[PDB]
């Protein structure tokens, strides 16, 4: 059982530059690449006393890539894994998908091919990118399409970072997001939404850090990924692989956009403050102040939900907590799913990374749900898209690169149809 991770764009590469030290810290691998069986899912032991990760970081600028090359983890990543282009997509989806993509994706996929052949029980794919930028949208979608035409059947966990509603660090990111999503629909099977403002708020309130940088955001995203992969990595009372999500979280072929949350986000002193049990952490995993995407679920109704647990957790307390939550009326499910909960338990508690602020908690829970809050999010993005498209702004860059307003029109109508499907299904 092994799953391969690929990272595209600055955001994805830094999320990986978080997740990998988290992983090697969990498995007791020193940065140079050797220990003083569970690692087999991520790190392949080659030769003698050497462990190499199953991932490729690829991007067109060389800055982040060679900063990783010269950083702390020089000996860990194989020098052939780190692919680097020559010039940015410059927040241009057309530039990232048609100019440099045609030159980079072939090498990228013929490297992931050798990765796959070295792999033997390959569980699936998982991609790390943010659609706001140029590369991670354009060439991310291109590589997605080519991997789909290569394998197709296998699951593709896409942990995609979407722009915040009101916090913004770009200009043409609505265009990039809609153009990427138009392909993200029919190729990925499980897409996990991530935001930035929601994580800022989470670390402001719960992690009570006044000036959070991208490092803490990436650290906690890595914690979430590790918590959702711990079922494959270790053994528990009730384990699930990557393929249970594929059947329990996608009721319809196109309605696949899952919101994530994690509990308990606790600092050092609040660990001694609050009593760590199962009922209160399961309760905390559901209010809007603890979810990774800034949206209000009360406007929507839940369709499916999955709860991974780590640590000293017995099925009694999780069963009681789920019963209490189902009896609760503040959160409402949908008629087409009477049994909307999927629990899973693992024995190993979460680890602590020296340098973060998270304290050593005996247990933790990760929540992945399907709702319509994604439906309002996409509607908001569509509105702010058509507002700018009404005046044909920034379209000259795309038409100069080689695209037209056609695919804009199809992306717009496809998102409209997507909203039609959400409002029909939520009924």
């Amino acid at each position: 059982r092994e799953v391969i991770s690929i990272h595209i764009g600055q955001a994805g590469i830094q999320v990986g530059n978080a997740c990998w030290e988290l992983y090697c810290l969990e498995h007791g691998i020193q940065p140079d690449g050797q220990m003083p069986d569970a690692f087999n899912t991520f790190f392949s032991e080659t030769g003698a006393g050497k462990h190499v990760p199953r991932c490729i970081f690829l991007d067109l600028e060389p800055t982040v890539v060679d900063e990783v090359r010269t950083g702390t983890y020089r000996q860990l990543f194989h020098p052939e894994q780190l692919i680097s282009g020559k010039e940015d997509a410059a927040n241009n989806f057309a530039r990232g998908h048609y100019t440099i993509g045609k030159e980079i994706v072939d090498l990228a996929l013929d490297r992931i091919r050798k990765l796959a052949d070295n792999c033997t029980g390959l569980q699936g794919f998982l991609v790390f990118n943010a659609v706001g930028g140029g590369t991670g949208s354009g060439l991310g979608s291109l590589l997605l399409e080519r991997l789909s035409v290569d394998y197709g059947k296998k699951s593709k966990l896409g942990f995609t970072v979407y722009p915040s509603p009101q916090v913004s660090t770009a200009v043409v990111e609505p265009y990039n997001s809609v153009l990427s999503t138009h392909s993200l629909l029919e190729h990925t099977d499980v897409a996990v939404m991530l935001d930035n403002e929601a994580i800022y708020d989470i670390c402001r309130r719960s992690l009570d850090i006044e000036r959070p940088t991208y490092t803490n955001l990436n650290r906690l995203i890595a914690q979430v990924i590790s918590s959702l992969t711990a079922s494959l990595r270790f053994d528990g009372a009730l384990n699930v692989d990557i393929t249970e999500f594929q059947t329990n979280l996608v009721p319809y072929p196109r309605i696949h956009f899952m919101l994530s949350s994690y509990a308990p986000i606790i600092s050092a002193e609040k660990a001694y403050h609050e009593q760590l049990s199962v009922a209160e952490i399961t309760n905390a995993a559901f209010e809007p102040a603890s979810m990774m995407v800034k949206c209000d679920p009360r406007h929507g109704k839940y369709m499916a939900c999955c709860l991974m647990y780590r640590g000293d957790v017995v099925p009694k307390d999780v069963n009681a907590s789920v019963a209490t939550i189902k009896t609760k009326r503040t959160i409402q499910f949908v008629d087409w799913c009477p049994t909307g909960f999927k629990c899973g338990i693992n024995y190993q508690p979460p680890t602590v990374v020296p340098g973060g602020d998270l304290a050593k908690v005996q247990r933790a829970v990760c929540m992945i749900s399907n709702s319509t809050a994604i439906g309002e999010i996409f509607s908001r993005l569509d509105h702010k898209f058509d507002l700018m498209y009404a005046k044909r702004a920034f379209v000259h860059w795309y038409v100069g690169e080689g695209m037209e307003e056609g695919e804009f029109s199809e992306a717009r109508e496809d998102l409209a149809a997507l909203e039609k499907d959400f409002e029909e299904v939520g009924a």
Binding site: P62, D88, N91, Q166, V167, A393
Partner: protein
């Protein structure tokens, strides 16, 4: 990997470029003789951008000096950091245009442009992956405006796929040096709007005002003006030369700041800018840098930003910080001053962060704003041009060198329609 080719034209261009190269050499820690002597290793990894390696551990600038008078070259070689320039890049005339756009673009151009093009092209293949060209000059002089415009035309004709920065200083009626300023500026901007990918508009009046008010200096010398412009010049390109938590390409900035092909006239600022008497009573924090940056009196143009709307704006930071404080500060500046931004373009603010602050400072920032206030300055120049043209004053020295009236008429029409689109989108 990404390569910028620098070109200096005219007296102002040559002096500003000399100051800029001094600043860049200081930032990368190379001595005025050309040998690296810095301590940190961040400098080595990005010196290919402005310095081709030379034998003996010497680094030479990737810039071409162009003029027509021996005096400018003598001054450039006189000053400090003057021994690093490659002696064969001195493309050089003998007579001087003398504030004549005809002399700069039709008479002396016909025999200097070939040589300068050969040198520029050869320096272009000297680097593996081109990124763009940056030319520093004036818009009122002869050897800086006309010849610079012709070189831009030939370059953009040969290389149609590279970025183009034109750091051009523009006249002001209050600080007026020569007399044919409208005549030169109108034609120069006529060609720049159809040719240049973006233009960095500068003027002496705004720099003098900033030095009087914020810096509270007694004598604002040309050295000080050039130093401020040089700080801007290094700040705009720090992103390619240093790693940061949010790296921004020059083409990335161009795409984020150019919504329409002809609305590519930007206005510049820099922060912090305080007097020594007040340096000790101030902290160093993002809120105060942001308020100074967005203050209208920190701007380096004679155009009030409050008299128009900000189509787009961008801020490039240098120093160790938090993106949370950065983007919440941009949120605040967009929300409080909501009416000053355009309504059909959401998220009018681009932000970038770099991990290396300049020498001598704890933290720095650079503002670049594509607003619609530049139409005031353009109308200011255009009314002078029409007043001079209705009487055909000074026109005979232009018509006696090969020129006629149609190009002036077309330039006036182009400027009128261009300010018309600024007003229309305003």
């Amino acid at each position: 990997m990404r390569e910028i080719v620098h070109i200096q034209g005219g007296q102002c261009g040559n002096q500003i470029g000399a100051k800029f190269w001094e600043v860049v050499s200081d930032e990368h820690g190379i001595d005025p003789t050309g040998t690296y002597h810095g301590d940190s290793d961040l400098q080595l990894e990005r010196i290919n951008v402005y310095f081709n390696e030379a034998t003996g551990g010497r680094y030479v600038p990737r810039a071409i000096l162009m003029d027509l008078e021996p005096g400018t070259m003598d001054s450039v070689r006189s000053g400090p950091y003057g021994q690093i320039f490659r002696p064969d890049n001195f493309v050089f005339g003998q007579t001087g245009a003398g504030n004549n756009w005809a002399k700069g673009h039709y008479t002396e151009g016909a025999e200097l442009i070939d040589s300068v093009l050969d040198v520029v092209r050869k320096e272009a293949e000297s680097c593996d992956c081109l990124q763009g060209f940056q030319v520093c000059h004036s818009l009122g002089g002869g050897t800086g405006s006309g010849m610079g415009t012709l070189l831009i035309s030939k370059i953009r004709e040969e290389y149609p796929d590279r970025m183009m920065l034109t750091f051009s200083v523009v006249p002001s009626p209050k600080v007026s040096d020569t007399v044919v300023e409208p005549y030169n500026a109108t034609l120069s901007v006529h060609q720049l709007v159809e040719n240049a990918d973006e233009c960095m508009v500068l003027d002496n009046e705004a720099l003098y005002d900033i030095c009087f008010r914020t810096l509270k200096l007694t004598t604002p010398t040309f050295g000080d003006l050039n130093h401020l412009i040089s700080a801007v010049m290094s700040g705009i390109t720090c992103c390619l030369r240093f790693p940061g938590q949010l790296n921004a390409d020059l083409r990335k900035l161009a795409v984020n700041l150019i919504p329409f092909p002809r609305l590519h006239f930007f206005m510049v600022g820099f922060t912090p800018l305080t007097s020594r008497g007040s340096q000790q009573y101030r902290a160093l924090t993002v809120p105060e840098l942001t308020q100074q940056m967005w203050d209208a009196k920190n701007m380096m143009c004679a155009a009030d930003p409050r008299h128009g709307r900000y189509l787009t704006a961008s801020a490039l930071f240098r120093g160790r910080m938090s993106t949370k404080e950065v983007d919440e500060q941009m949120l605040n500046v967009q929300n409080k001053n909501s009416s000053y931004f355009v309504e059909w373009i959401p998220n009018n603010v681009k932000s970038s962060v770099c991990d290396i602050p300049p020498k001598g400072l704890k933290m720095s920032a650079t503002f670049i704003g594509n607003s619609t206030a530049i139409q005031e300055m353009f109308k200011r120049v255009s009314e002078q041009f029409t007043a001079m043209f209705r009487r055909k004053a000074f026109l005979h020295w232009y018509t006696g060198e090969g020129m006629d009236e149609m190009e002036f008429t077309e330039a006036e029409s182009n400027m009128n329609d261009l300010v018309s689109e600024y007003q229309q989108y305003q």
